[PDB]
Design a protein around this ligand. Sequence first.
Ligand SMILES: [Zn+2]
Ligand SMILES: [Zn+2]
Lengths: 49, 146, 97, 243, 196, 49, 116
Amino acid sequence: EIQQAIKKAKDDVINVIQKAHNMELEPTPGNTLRQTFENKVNRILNDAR
Amino acid sequence: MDIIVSEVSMIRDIRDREIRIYTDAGRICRPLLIVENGSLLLKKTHVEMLKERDYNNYSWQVLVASGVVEYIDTLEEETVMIAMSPYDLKQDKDYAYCTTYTHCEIHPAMILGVCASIIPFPDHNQSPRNTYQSAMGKQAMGVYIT
Amino acid sequence: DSPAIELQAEAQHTSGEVETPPRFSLKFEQIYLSKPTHWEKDGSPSPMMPNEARLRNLTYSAPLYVDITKTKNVEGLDPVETQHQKTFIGKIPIMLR
Amino acid sequence: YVFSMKDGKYAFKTEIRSCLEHSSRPTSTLWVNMMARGSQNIKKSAIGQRIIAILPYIKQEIPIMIVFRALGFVADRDILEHIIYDFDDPEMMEMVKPSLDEAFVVQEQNVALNFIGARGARPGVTKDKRIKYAKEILQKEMLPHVGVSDFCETKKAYFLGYMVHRLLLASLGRRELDDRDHYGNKRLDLAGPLLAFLFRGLFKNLMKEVRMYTQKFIDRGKDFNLELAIKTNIITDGLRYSL
Amino acid sequence: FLTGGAARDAEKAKNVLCRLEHTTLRKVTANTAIYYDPDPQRTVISEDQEFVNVYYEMPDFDPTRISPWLLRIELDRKRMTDKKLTMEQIAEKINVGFGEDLNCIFNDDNADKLVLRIRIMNNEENKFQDEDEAVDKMEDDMFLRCIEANMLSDMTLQGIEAIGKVYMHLPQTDSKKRIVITETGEFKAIGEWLLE
Amino acid sequence: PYGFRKRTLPHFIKDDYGPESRGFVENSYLAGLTPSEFYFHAMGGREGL
Amino acid sequence: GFVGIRFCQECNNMLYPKEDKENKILLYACRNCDYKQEADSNCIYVNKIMHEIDELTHIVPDVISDPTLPRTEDHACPKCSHREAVFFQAQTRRAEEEMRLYYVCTNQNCTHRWTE
Ligand SMILES: [Zn+2]
Ligand SMILES: [Zn+2]
């Protein structure tokens, strides 16, 4: 279950990278697209951990 | 090993159209294997030759002069592709992380030093505790010299 | 790469000064390094040991010898060359192995 | 090396510590900087960023174009061929404008040498010793690694144009800025070069002592002994003390 | 913190943000250029020609006294919408930051691009002034460039020069919320909009 | 950080933002680390000291 | 449009703008010399704050011979229909806020560079 959750989180962050590369990531107010993407990736990894 | 020695570092800055040649002292290099076409240049014939340097003469300088091991410095690491193992080389192209490999690590465990390589299974421990063991590894007791 | 020593005599404090003083040139061209050899109080050389240097609190060093070319030139005369070979200049320490 | 300053009058700096290989006259630091945009002047608002150069043994700031004209290039097109490799680049052509807009008074090589020599240490008189001192700075202090002999101004001008080209490339982000803790830009001094440097110092001291001995034994008209001239304790004592 | 409708409506809070955040020309425009215009009613830009003759049909100054040098500023529409500015505020800010020395001609609201033509009128009464020696005698295009740098890097359209980046947010804890007392006697925390 | 040219290590690819090159560790200390994520753990553990 | 400067045909200096009133034409003249010419365009200084970079011409086409760059085999070339291409991000200070991929055709005879 832990390995499947880690693989699912890796697939989710790969999909996040793919949608960021495809110009589909809308930046949140108060920060840039770099900070929004980094915050999304860090939140995904911390939630998975 | 004809004109240029293996000590000389050289960089091809492709994105900036530059060639940099460094022959000066102070540079630090790692000897690494040479990979072309997804295959190592080290073969089992070289293994049999390295099983008879224990017998007579097939020293490490012969292996460097054979063209399979090159001294790659830290400046040339920005332009080369190095792998963990030949298992990374044998991956199929449908899920391959990379298809153009130029170098391969002989063993990753040599990135450690002298007092940090004495830890049994250092990858299962903590890095500050590994630094502590390297600090008190010099404070151990034993036969220092014969 | 060291510059050669060029000389010119200046006897300006005495009468009868020669308008063309003699001149000297010194050049160093060759370096010889011998084995680490210790000279005792009587001057007898002996090959030192690193254990001997550790026990006697000596320095594990080897002497260095230089070849000196000395050219003596007079304005209006042929200069003459003199070779001072194997001139001892000092002991450089030797790292072990 | 190209670095960025968060504070001060310099938006970006380029530093090179050039030295002649395996020789004396140790390493000289050459800087080429750009002025910060935040200058409270009405005239300097349209000028904007401006390229200046900091020379060895000179405490003043000299624009790079007077330095380029001091190397024997009075035309702007030749200097821009030296610096700007491709003439089709718009914004770099705009960026090289304000230093040229500052440097109109200097348009001749000897005037440039006088401009260099008037701002250096111990300034001379009647402009000829200042020209000679400027040639001494440009030949023996500016980039000894590319050449210290005569007729080396072409390669020095090429290297200066390449380094200004690198600074103006890093002004736009087309090339990444250099990193101080990047270990590829670092070297390790082992026992070899360090003992070589001690050998340089002790050899210079030995030659000074030998010169003193033969100078105090040459003024009396007599000769000298070469074995008595060399004090053998100097190099051994210095190496023993430093080790 | 905000009071009234600003604390509960995001639009009035964003209008407060536009009154607080430092908005120079750097945060609103697209690009600048300097042109030479020998004929103001027959200018080189054809897209200006649809409206500049509208501006010079009933001019406020003699067109034969203006300088041929023109300053063409093209603005960004998205930043213009984000800062909630109108064009007449920008023209008034130009006219109070430079006085009567500059004439400003602005584009229409529904144009494809926001085009600005800034000119200087040749003050012939000030051209005969004495006491002018070694004071960097100044050319008209160079003067246009220096006042262009002045209006690009120094002046403020709106906000405070000592205030940098401004963020709008809602508090999620009971520390920056407004704690009030209800009619029942309980403490109610209202999460009003606020500025950082 | 990208110590190399758009790479944390030469064993990865340029412009890679995946969790292997980012610094995320998908394995436990009981299972053992890959050398890249062990180096990233060294990066993390140096900062505490 | 954008304009540059011109060099003197006699002493290779700048040719600064100048306005004379007897013909209502700009003259691009020499300031250390006596050379002058007419104006082909009308701009003297264009400054762009948010400038649109054409970085596809900025990237060197030799980066197809780079083992450290990623490769893809799904996005075909728009010019020569090559399946293999090299995708990477730009290096300028404007392009890191977009996460935009830039594709270079790996064919040595085509070397098409584009953006998807
Ligand atoms: Zn001319
Ligand atoms: Zn193609």
